[PDB]
Amino acid sequence: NLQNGPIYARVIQKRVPNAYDKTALALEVGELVKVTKINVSGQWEGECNGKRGHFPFTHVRLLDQQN
């Protein structure tokens, strides 16, 4: 499934989206986000806390549900 795919990256920083940004993804420190396409510029775009757009992965943590 996509909604609850394998990718499990949580957030630790709360960053507000720009006013002039429609496809912007909001980030709330301490939340579950599952992007769709990881960029090489540190920007992951996809699914974030049930939202769609682009967010600075430089303010989030990624995990593979494996401890």
SS3 label, residue 55: strand
Residue 36's nearest CA partner among 67, 59, 57 is 57
Experimental technique: NMR
- How far is the C-alpha of 30 from the C-alpha of 15, rounded, in Å? 11
- How far is the C-alpha of 31 from the C-alpha of 40, rounded, in Å? 23
Beta bridge partners of residue 65, listed in sequence order: none
Please give the CATH topology (third level) of the domain spanning 1-67. SH3 type barrels. (2.30.30)
- How far is the C-alpha of 19 from the C-alpha of 1, rounded, in Å? 32
